[PDB]
A paper describes a structure:
MytiLec, a lectin isolated from the Mediterranean mussel Mytilus galloprovincialis, was identified through a study of marine organisms and their adaptation to different habitats and environmental systems, and shown to bind α-D-galactose and N-acetyl-α-D-galactosamine (α-GalNAc). The structure is well ordered, with the entire main-chain of each monomer visible in the 2mFo-DFc electron density map, revealing a β-trefoil fold consisting of three related sub-domains. MytiLec is somewhat unusual in binding ligand at each subdomain, and it forms a dimer in solution, giving a total of six ligand sites per protein.
In order to understand how MytiLec binds to galactose and GalNAc, and whether the acetyl group contacts the protein, co-crystals of MytiLec and GalNAc were grown. These crystals, in space-group C2, diffracted to slightly higher resolution than the apo crystals, and also had a dimer in the asymmetric unit showing identical interactions between partner chains. Six GalNAc molecules were identified in the electron density map, and were sufficiently ordered for the electron density map to show a large hole in the centre of each ring. The very high-resolution diffraction data allowed the GalNAc ligands to be placed unambiguously at three sites per polypeptide, related by the pseudo-symmetry of the protein sequence. The principal side-chain contacts made by MytiLec with GalNAc are all charged, with the ligand cradled by three histidines and two carboxyl groups. Five hydrogen bonds form between the protein and each of the six ligand molecules. A HxDxH motif is found in each sub-domain, the first histidine (His 32, His 80 or His 124) lying against the sugar ligand but making no hydrogen bond with it. The axially positioned O4 atom makes two hydrogen bonds to histidine residues, the first residue of the HPxGG motif and the last one of the HxDxH motif. D-glucose differs from D-galactose only in the position of this epimeric oxygen, so the structure implies strong selectivity for galactose over glucose. The C2-N-acetyl group of the ligand points away from the protein and makes no significant contact with it, indicating that galactose will bind as well as GalNAc with the same binding mode.
Residue numbers in the entry:
A (entry chain B): 1 to 149
B (entry chain A): 0 to 149
């Protein structure tokens, strides 16, 4: 499956900063309003719920910056080519969030309900409406799609 | 496609057709029972994103509210039936650990016990609590969660 990662409260989407089809390692993941093929994602299942969030255009995957196992609050999210267990996430399409292996969630930095374009994404333990995400068709940004297949 | 056991989280019992047949009759009740064997394996056939059919692997019959109504009341029994239609849609919530019908009620053991005895019937009920939690596990390791959506 190929999908968009849509911030529920704002309707903005996860992008590599700059929108490249081949972002460098450690490129930040931001929120931005635009839809294009360089903000499509895939999900590579590794173990049941756990897997890699894959930037479709480049094949790089989402990491906490630095690849720490138990990233603290405010750790930036980036793309990197490496595959390892510290880049495992789950796509909770029931509670509408993205959870890292060590139990924190993807947030817009600052936790706004309407983050501006280019807002950084970070890890944070809190749960609230401004950390919800839904996973939608590139063809219809309101149509949820199953990311596990 | 993924084959799995439907395990009542609190008790460790599993969903079975009552009687354990490879070919249960239509409207056979779904019960909880401790045994593990190929006649209590399930599969999930995705229809629309989260929604799909919970399929008894041996027979090909799927889980329905008895009588097949769109918005079944509390205490509606769960059964197997061959028919495929939109009143037999469920989602396998492997994050909250529950089985939810399209109209919003959950699979429960009748009475809501943490340790239901073997042969306890399953029903639909809107309440949420620990005794309506289910996990979806490997036939080869009843403690290993498996992805049912594949
Ligand atoms: C014109 C152009 O490529 N625009 C993109 C935009 O669509 C978005 O992807 C953004 C993310 O930081 O990077 C660029 O500015
Ligand atoms: C050597 C080493 O630890 N490499 C990791 C790399 O694997 C990736 O996780 C990256 C994410 O920012 O952080 C580090 O550079
Ligand atoms: C009080 C408040 O809004 N807190 C939020 C917190 O919940 C989390 O979303 C964080 C992400 O950077 O941004 C804020 O600090
Ligand atoms: C020997 C045998 O298949 N026994 C089964 C048991 O395993 C269980 O499936 C039960 C469910 O009502 O039906 C039978 O008693
Ligand atoms: C004619 C009619 O409603 N048939 C339904 C059938 O499709 C199935 O849903 C069954 C489940 O117990 O309930 C009824 O018999
Ligand atoms: C126990 C209790 O107060 N309520 C439960 C309810 O939550 C549900 O589990 C139902 C299923 O038949 O069994 C009881 O009525």
């Amino acid at each position: 499956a190929t999908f968009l990662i849509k911030h529920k409260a704002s309707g903005k989407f996860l992008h590599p900063k700059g929108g490249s089809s081949n972002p460098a390692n450690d490129t930040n993941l931001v929120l931005h309003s635009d839809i294009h093929e360089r903000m499509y994602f895939q999900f590579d299942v590794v173990d049941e719920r756990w897997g890699y969030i894959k930037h479709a255009a480049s094949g790089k995957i989402v990491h906490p910056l630095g690849g720490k196992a138990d990233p603290p609050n405010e750790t930036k999210l980036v793309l990197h080519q490496d595959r390892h267990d510290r880049a495992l996430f789950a796509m909770d399409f029931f509670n509408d969030n993205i959870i890292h292996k060590a139990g924190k969630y993807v947030h817009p930095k600052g936790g706004s309900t309407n983050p501006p374009n280019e807002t950084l994404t970070v890890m944070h333990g809190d749960k609230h409406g401004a950390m919800e995400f839904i996973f939608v068709s590139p063809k219809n940004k309101d149509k949820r799609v199953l990311v596990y297949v």
